[PDB]
Design a protein around this ligand. Structure first.
Ligand SMILES: Oc1cccc(-c2nc(N3CCOCC3)c3oc4ncccc4c3n2)c1
Lengths: 277, 1014
C-alpha cells in the first residue's frame, strides 16, 4: 500500500518548515530518526532529508529531473515516497558507506492525533487553554523559585567571605595574645621581684580584656556559621523544589505544543488561537 | 557597607587598637576621621595604658586590619577617611611596616580595581594559572615598549588615540553635504589668564590634515613671502583639540576622517576646535612606569597516535544531588565527547540508579579511536533525573573537561569534578557551550571519574608529525593534484554558490563530500574556509591532519569573516590561530572598538588561559587607552560571575599592572560606581515603602556628605572616558519612577570650552535590571546605521551610550531635548504633527518631517529584524529637530516567543495614524500619499541592505552564546534573524515577506505592490 501513497499524505513529510523546526524535532534522538521538508527556495534541489546518526543531524538533498528523484546522478526513484521506503528497508550505506543506517523512526505529523483523540475543535481548544494555564502557572512558580535561588546563592557567598574575614580577625587577636605573653614573661618575672603586684592589675586587666574580646569575636563567627548552614540548607531545599517543577514544566509545554499542532492543522484562525493561549 | 553588616557607619564609633607592646586600647573616633590623626589621638592615650614606655613614636608604626574581602591590609596612605577603608570590623593593628612598600600599594590598587584581592591568585595550585600569571607579562612589557618607542608622540597616542573612521573615503551623500568639497571650522584660543577666548574661523578642504588646518589658523597685514617662516618653524607648536572634549587630533588624517568632524558634517553643525600648546600636553603626560611583579620523568612520553585503544571513561560516584526522592524515580550520568558543539560520536549514559545513592562505577565505552581524538576534544557531562509508560529527563548539574590540558597532555587517572547549576532556561541534558573546569565552589555536587592510564605522559603530536601523516594520507588516497586536475566551471560555480550561504545554514552531506573533494581548489576562493572546515571529519585524524596543512598556508580573509571562526563551532586552535592572525593584520582600532563586546565574550570559549586571542586583545588594550578603557569595563562587569571569575580576574590584573596612570582614573570611576550601588541598594532594601519624596531627601543628605562629594565629582565617564564629569548638580539629580529606582544624574562639564559642546552631562544610573541586552541592541543599531550610510541610505539612528558595569548594574546616556510620545500626546491623531510643527515652524519644517521619516524607517526595519519588545508611547521618543528613536529594548530575538506557543515573527514597531500623519505632512489619507510611498521604499532598501550584511550580525550573535544572556543560550535563539531577513528565501521573496509582515501588522494600511492611479 505504501509506494502509491501521495507525498502529501506521508507522515514524515512536513512541507515547508524551518531547519530550526526540524532541529527541535530531532534534538537528542536515536539514530535512524528522520523527516522530510521542502528544500530552500533559493537552492537547487526539491526536498531535504534529515536523519540522526552519531548524535548529529545529517542533511541530504533530494533532487528531481524528468520524473526521477535521488541524492545524486543518476536519479533512479519514481517518487519521494519510493525513495524513503527503500531506505527504510535498506541501509544508506548503498548511497554512502560512511553512514550505515536505515530510516527507522519517522517523525510523524499525525503524532498529536495519537495524543489528543478528542475530535471537537472547541473542546480541543478548551483543553489547550487549561494546559496553557497550568503551564503558565508552573512557569511563574519556577520563576519565583529561581529568583530566591539566586538571591540565596549570593547571600551565602557574602557570608562565606565574611567567615574568612572573621577567621583572619581571630588569627590577629591570637597573635596579640602571643605578643603580650611573649613580652610579659620577662617584665612580670622581674616585677614580682621589686614587690610590684600593682604592675599586674594593669597588665592583667589588659590580658583579660584582650581574652574577652577574642571570645566575643569567636562567638560572633560561630553565629554566622550556623546562619550560613541554615541558609545553605534553604538553598538545597530550593534546588529540590525546582528539580521537582522542571519535569512537569517540560511535559506541560510539550502537551500544549501538541494541542497547538492539532489545532494549527484544521487551520484555526490565529485570533481564535490567541484567546486560548 | 563601610563596616560589616552596616550600610552606613554612625558618626562616632569605637576602635580596638592592638599595640606591638601587647596592649589593647579602645578609642573614640569620628566616621570622618583620617588615620593620621587617629594615630595621633592614639599614642596620646597609649601612655595611660601599661608598657607604653616601649612604644616608639607614631612615626615608625603603620595601621593594619581586615577588609570586607577578608584580606589583611596595611594602610600606607594615612590621609584616608576611616569610612573609606572598608574595614570588616573596627580594629586596627599597629606595626612597623616591612617589605616592598610601592609594590604593595600597587597590589592593593589593582585589587580595588579588580574587585578581588590579588593575593588570592598566589594561593592557586593550578599550574596553568601561575603560568598565565607569569607568561602574560611578556605581552605587558612588549606593549609598554611600543608606547615608549616614538616618544612622546608614541606616549600621547596611547593616552589620546585618534578617533577615526576606518576609511577616509567619503560616502556620496556625505560629501555632497559639503560646499565644493570644503568645510567651515571654528578654531579657538585662550588669549591670556583673563581666559576670554578668541576665534579664528576657517574654510578649508575636508581632507586637510590638522597641520594645514593649524596653518590656515595663524593666517586668520604683513609680508607674504616670509609666511613660510613660522609655519615651517612653528607647526608642532600646537595641536588640535575638540571643544568640550578630551579628544585630540594627534595623527595625520584627513580632517573628515575623525569621527567628530564626520559627525559634525552629518548633523549640519559647526566643528569647534581649540588650539592647544603641544608642550602643555606632552609634558603633562605621566610617562608612567611599569614594573615587573615579584611572581616573575624517565618514562619517555608517548604520542597520542601511538596509543591503540578505544576511548573509555569510568564514572565512579557523586557526593550528592539535591532531589526529592518522592518526585524523582532515578538518576544517571549523561556524557559526551565534543568538538565545539558537535558530538564526535554517540553520547553515552551510565545505568540509572536511585536518587539516594549516586553510585555507578562503570566504564563507559565510546566508538572513537584514541588517535582520532582531535586537539580541541572535550568531555561534556551532567547528572540527570528521570521521571503513562513515558518519562522526562532533566539536568541536575553539569561540567566540562578538556581531554587535553594546556601542555597538550592527555588527561589520565582519577579526577574529581565539582558541577555547576544549570543556567535558567536550559533544558538540554548536556551543556557543551558552558565553560570547562571544576566549579570553584566545593560545597556542591562532586562527581568522581577515572581516565585510563597508558604508562607514559601522552602528548598530542607536534605539527611536523601531523604534516608527515597528512602527506601519507593524501598519497594513499588515490597535492600537485590541484593543478593536475583542472577545475571545471560547473564546480567553480557550485563552490561560489556554497560560499554565499550564511553561517547558520547547514551544508548537506553531498556538499560536505563535494567540498572535501575540492579542498585543494578552495584556496582560490578563501572566504569558503568556514564551510570547508564544516565538511571535515574532526573524528578522523587523517582528514584533520590534511586540513591543518591547508590552514597553515591559507590566504588571509577579512576580519569580519575571521570573526565567524571565533565562535563555539570552531574550537580547533589552528583555526582560531588563523582567525586571530587575520585580526592582527587587517583589523583597525576603530573596528576593534566596535566589536570589542563580542571579542571579550569569545574569551569564554577558549579552552585555555593562555591563547593568541587574549594576547592580541591585551596588547591592544595596553597600546590604546580608549580600547583599554572598555576592555577593562567589559571584563570587570562580569567579575561577579564565578564561571569567568578566575579568568577575567587574571586578565584584569595584567591590564592594571601595565596600563600605567589610567589605573588611578579607573579606580575613581570604580569608587564612584560603588557608592551609587550602595545608595540604590539602600533605597531598594531599606527605603522601599517610603515615599518618592522621602527617598530623594535621604539621597541628598547621603550624597551631600563630603566623602560622597569627593567620590562623585571629578572623574571620567565610563560611558565615554573623554567626557569629564565635574561638580554634581545635586539639586537637579533625581530618582526616576521605575521599580529599581534609577538615578537621573547631572554633572557639570568642567571643560573651559564646555559651552561649545555641552555644559552639562546627564547619565541614568540603573541598579537592578540587566543592561547587557540593551547594550548589545544599541551596538547592532549603530552598526546598521553604518551599513546604511556607506550604502548611501541616510537614516539617522540614535545608539545612545549604554554600558553594563556589573551584575544588573549599568549606565544610560541621556539624550538632550528628547520626549516620550506620551509626553507629547497627553491631554487626537494630529497632536504629534502639531507638536513638531510648533518646534520647527517656518521654512525648516521640511527638514524635520524628512528627519522624522528617515528615523522611523530605520527603527521600523531595525526593530522588526531584531524582534525587540513591543513599542508603546513610553518606549518611543522624539527630538525637537524631528528625529525619532527608541529606548528600553528589553528582550530581543522574540524571547516571549515561548511562554506562548505562537511561532510567528511580530512587528514591535507599528505605525499608528499619529506617525503616518507626520510622514504625510498632515495629509488626510496618510497611507496613499507620495510621502508614505517613498517612506516604504526607504524601509525596503534598509531591509535589503541589512540582508546583504546578514553574516556580520549572525557572527556577532554567535560570539555571544556564552554570555549568560537568556535571550541567546542557543543557536536556535540566533535563528530568529534568519527568519526576519528570510535568509533561506530568494531576495525578491524576502522583500515580499517583509511587505506581508507589515501589511498584516498595519491591517492593510501598509498598502502593497498593488497601487491605483485609477
Ligand atoms: O536602554 C534603556 C534601558 C532602560 C531604560 C531606558 C530609558 N532611557 C531614556 N532615555 C535614554 C536616552 O536619552 C533620553 C533618556 C528614558 O527617558 C525616559 N523618560 C521617562 C521615563 C523613562 C525614560 C527612559 N528610559 C533605556
Amino acid at each position: 500500500m505504501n509506494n502509491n501513497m501521495s507525498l502529501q499524505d506521508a507522515e514524515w513529510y512536513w512541507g515547508d518548515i524551518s531547519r530550526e523546526e526540524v532541529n527541535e524535532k530531532l534534538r537528542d534522538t536515536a539514530d535512524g530518526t528522520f523527516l522530510v521538508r521542502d528544500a530552500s527556495t533559493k537552492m537547487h534541489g526539491d526536498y531535504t532529508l534529515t536523519l540522526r546518526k552519531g548524535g548529529n543531524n545529517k542533511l541530504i538533498k533530494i533532487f528531481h529531473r524528468d520524473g526521477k528523484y535521488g541524492f545524486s546522478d543518476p536519479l533512479t526513484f519514481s517518487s519521494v515516497v519510493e525513495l524513503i521506503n527503500h531506505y527504510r528497508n535498506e541501509s544508506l550505506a548503498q548511497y554512502n558507506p560512511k553512514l550505515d543506517v536505515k530510516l527507522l523512526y519517522p517523525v510523524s505529523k499525525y503524532q498529536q492525533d495519537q495524543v489528543v483523540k478528542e475530535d471537537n475543535i472547541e473542546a480541543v481548544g478548551k483543553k489547550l487553554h487549561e494546559y496553557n494555564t497550568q503551564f503558565q502557572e508552573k512557569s511563574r512558580e519556577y520563576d519565583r523559585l529561581y529568583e530566591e535561588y539566586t538571591r540565596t546563592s549570593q547571600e551565602i557567598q557574602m557570608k562565606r567571605t565574611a567567615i574568612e574575614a572573621f577567621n583572619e580577625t581571630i588569627k590577629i587577636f591570637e597573635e596579640q595574645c602571643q605578643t603580650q605573653e611573649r613580652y610579659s614573661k620577662e617584665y612580670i618575672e622581674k616585677f614580682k621581684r621589686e614587690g610590684n603586684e600593682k604592675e599586674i592589675q594593669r597588665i592583667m586587666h589588659n590580658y583579660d580584656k584582650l581574652k574577652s574580646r577574642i571570645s566575643e569575636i569567636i562567638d560572633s563567627r560561630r553565629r554566622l556559621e550556623e546562619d550560613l548552614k541554615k541558609q545553605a540548607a534553604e538553598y538545597r531545599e530550593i534546588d529540590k523544589r525546582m528539580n521537582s517543577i522542571k519535569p512537569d514544566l517540560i511535559q506541560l509545554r510539550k502537551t500544549r505544543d501538541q494541542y497547538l499542532m492539532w489545532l494549527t492543522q484544521k487551520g484555526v484562525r490565529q485570533k481564535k488561537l490567541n484567546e486560548w493561549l | 557597607g563601610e563596616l560589616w553588616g552596616i550600610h552606613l557607619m554612625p558618626p562616632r564609633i569605637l576602635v580596638e587598637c592592638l599595640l606591638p607592646n601587647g596592649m589593647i586600647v579602645t578609642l573614640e573616633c569620628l566616621r570622618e576621621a583620617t588615620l593620621i590623626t587617629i594615630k595621633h589621638e592614639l599614642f596620646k592615650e597609649a601612655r595611660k595604658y601599661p608598657l607604653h614606655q616601649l612604644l616608639q613614636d607614631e612615626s615608625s608604626y603603620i595601621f593594619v586590619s581586615v577588609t570586607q574581602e577578608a584580606e589583611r591590609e596595611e594602610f600606607f596612605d594615612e590621609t584616608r577617611r576611616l569610612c573609606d577603608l572598608r574595614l570588616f570590623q573596627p580594629f586596627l593593628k599597629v606595626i612597623e611596616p616591612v617589605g616592598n612598600r610601592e609594590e604593595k600599594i600597587l597590589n592593593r590598587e589593582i585589587g580595588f580595581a579588580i574587585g578581588m584581592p590579588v593575593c588570592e591568585f598566589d594561593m592557586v595550585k593550578d599550574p596553568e594559572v601561575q603560568d598565565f600569571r607569569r607568561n602574560i607579562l611578556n605581552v605587558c612589557k612588549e606593549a609598554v615598549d611600543l608606547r615608549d618607542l616614538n616618544s612622546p608622540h608614541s606616549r600621547a597616542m596611547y593616552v589620546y588615540p585618534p578617533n577615526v573612521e576606518s576609511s577616509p573615503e567619503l560616502p556620496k551623500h556625505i560629501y555632497n553635504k559639503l560646499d565644493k568639497g570644503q568645510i567651515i571650522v571654528v578654531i579657538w584660543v585662550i588669549v591670556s589668564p583673563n581666559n576670554d577666548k578668541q576665534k579664528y574661523t576657517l574654510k578649508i578642504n575636508h581632507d586637510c590634515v590638522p597641520e594645514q588646518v593649524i596653518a590656515e589658523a595663524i593666517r586668520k597685514l604683513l609680508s607674504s613671502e616670509q609666511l613660510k617662516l613660522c609655519v615651517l618653524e612653528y607647526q608642532g607648536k600646537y595641536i588640535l583639540k575638540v571643544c568640550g572634549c578630551d579628544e585630540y587630533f594627534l595623527e595625520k588624517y584627513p580632517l573628515s576622517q575623525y569621527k567628530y568632524i564626520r559627525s559634525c558634517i552629518m548633523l549640519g553643525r559647526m566643528p569647534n576646535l581649540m588650539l592647544m600648546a603641544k608642550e602643555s600636553l606632552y609634558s603633562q603626560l605621566p610617562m608612567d612606569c611599569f614594573t615587573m611583579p615579584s611572581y616573575s620523568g624517565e618514562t619517555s612520553t608517548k604520542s597520542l597516535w601511538v596509543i591503540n585503544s578505544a576511548l573509555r571513561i569510568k564514572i565512579l560516584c557523586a557526593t550528592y544531588v539535591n532531589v526529592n526522592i518522592r518526585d524523582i524515580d532515578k538518576i544517571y550520568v549523561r556524557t559526551g565527547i565534543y568538538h565545539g558543539g558537535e558530538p564526535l560520536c554517540d553520547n553515552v549514559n551510565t545505568q540509572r540508579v536511585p536518587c539516594s545513592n549516586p553510585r555507578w562505577n562503570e566504564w563507559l565505552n565510546y566508538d572513537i579511536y584514541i588517535p582520532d581524538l582531535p586537539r580541541a576534544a572535550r568531555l561534556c557531562l551532567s547528572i540527570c533525573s528521570v521521571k503513562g509508560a513515558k518519562e522526562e529527563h532533566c539536568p541536575l548539574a553539569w561540567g566540562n573537561i578538556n581531554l587535553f590540558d594546556y601542555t597538550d597532555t592527555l588527561v589520565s587517572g582519577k579526577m574529581a569534578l565539582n558541577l555547576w547549576p544549570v543556567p535558567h532556561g536550559l533544558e538540554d541534558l548536556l551543556n557543551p557551550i558552558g565553560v570547562t573546569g571544576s566549579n570553584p565552589n566545593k560545597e556542591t555536587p562532586c562527581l568522581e571519574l577515572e581516565f585510563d592510564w597508558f604508562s607514559s605522559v601522552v602528548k598530542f603530536p607536534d605539527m611536523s608529525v601531523i604534516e608527515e601523516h597528512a602527506n601519507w594520507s593524501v598519497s594513499r588516497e588515490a597535492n600537485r593534484l590541484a593543478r593536475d586536475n583542472e577545475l571545471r566551471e560547473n564546480d567553480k560555480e557550485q563552490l561560489k554558490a556554497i560560499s554565499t550561504r550564511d553561517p547558520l545554514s547547514e551544508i548537506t552531506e553531498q556538499e560536505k563530500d563535494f567540498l572535501w573533494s575540492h579542498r585543494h581548489y578552495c584556496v582560490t576562493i578563501p572566504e569558503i574556509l568556514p564551510k570547508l572546515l564544516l565538511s571535515v571529519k574532526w573524528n578522523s585524524r587523517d582528514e584533520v591532519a590534511q586540513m591543518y596543512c591547508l590552514v597553515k598556508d591559507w590566504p588571509p580573509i577579512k576580519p569580519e569573516q575571521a570573526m565567524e571562526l571565533l565562535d563555539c563551532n570552531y574550537p580547533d586552535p589552528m583555526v582560531r590561530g588563523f582567525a586571530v592572525r587575520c585580526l592582527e593584520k587587517y583589523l583597525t582600532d576603530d573596528k576593534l572598538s566596535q566589536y570589542l563586546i563580542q571579542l571579550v565574550q569569545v574569551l569564554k570559549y577558549e579552552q585555555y588561559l593562555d591563547n593568541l586571542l587574549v594576547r592580541f586583545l591585551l596588547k591592544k588594550a595596553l597600546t590604546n587607552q580608549r580600547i583599554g578603557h572598555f576592555f577593562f569595563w567589559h571584563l570587570k562587569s562580569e567579575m561577579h560571575n564565578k564561571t569567568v571569575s578566575q579568568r577575567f580576574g587574571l586578565l584584569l590584573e595584567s591590564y592594571c599592572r601595565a596600563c600605567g596612570m589610567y589605573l588611578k582614573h579607573l579606580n575613581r570611576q570604580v569608587e564612584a560606581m560603588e557608592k551609587l550601588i550602595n545608595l540604590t541598594d539602600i533605597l531598594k532594601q531599606e527605603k522601599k515603602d517610603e515615599t518618592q519624596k522621602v527617598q530623594m531627601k535621604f539621597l541628598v543628605e547621603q550624597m551631600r556628605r563630603p566623602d560622597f562629594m569627593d567620590a562623585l565629582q571629578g572623574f571620567l565617564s565610563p560611558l565615554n572616558p573623554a567626557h569629564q564629569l565635574g561638580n554634581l548638580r545635586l539639586e537637579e539629580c533625581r530618582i526616576m519612577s521605575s521599580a529599581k529606582r534609577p538615578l537621573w544624574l547631572n554633572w557639570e562639564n568642567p571643560d573651559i570650552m564646555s559651552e561649545l559642546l555641552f555644559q552639562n552631562n546627564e547619565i541614568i544610573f540603573k541598579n537592578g535590571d540587566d543592561l547587557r541586552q540593551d547594550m548589545l541592541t544599541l551596538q547592532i543599531i549603530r552598526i546598521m546605521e553604518n551599513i546604511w550610510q556607506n550604502q548611501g541610505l541616510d537614516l539617522r539612528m540614535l545608539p545612545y551610550g549604554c554600558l553594563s558595569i556589573g551584575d544588573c548594574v549599568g549606565l544610560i546616556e541621556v539624550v538632550r531635548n528628547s520626549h516620550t510620545i506620551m509626553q507629547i500626546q497627553c491631554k487626537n491623531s494630529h497632536t504629534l504633527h502639531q507638536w513638531l510643527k510648533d518646534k520647527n515652524k517656518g521654512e525648516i519644517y521640511d527638514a524635520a518631517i524628512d528627519l522624522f521619516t528617515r528615523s522611523c524607517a530605520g527603527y521600523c526595519v531595525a526593530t522588526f529584524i531584531l524582534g525587540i519588545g513591543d513599542r508603546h508611547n513610553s518606549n518611543i521618543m522624539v527630538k525637537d529637530d524631528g528625529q525619532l528613536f527608541h529606548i528600553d529594548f528589553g528582550h530581543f530575538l522574540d524571547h516571549k516567543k515561548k511562554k506562548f506557543g505562537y511561532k510567528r515573527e511580530r512587528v514591535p514597531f507599528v505605525l499608528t495614524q499619529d506617525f503616518l500623519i507626520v510622514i504625510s505632512k498632515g495629509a488626510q489619507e496618510c497611507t496613499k500619499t507620495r510621502e508614505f510611498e517613498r517612506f516604504q521604499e526607504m524601509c525596503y532598501k534598509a531591509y535589503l541592505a541589512i540582508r546583504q550584511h546578514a553574516n556580520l550580525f549572525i557572527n556577532l550573535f554567535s560570539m555571544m552564546l556564552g554570555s549568560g544572556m537568556p535571550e541567546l543560550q542557543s543557536f536556535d535563539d540566533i535563528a530568529y534573524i534568519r527568519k526576519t531577513l528570510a535568509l533561506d528565501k530568494t531576495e525578491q521573496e524576502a522583500l515580499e515577506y517583509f511587505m506581508k509582515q507589515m501589511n498584516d501588522a498595519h491591517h492593510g494600511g501598509w498598502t502593497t505592490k498593488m497601487d491605483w492611479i485609477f
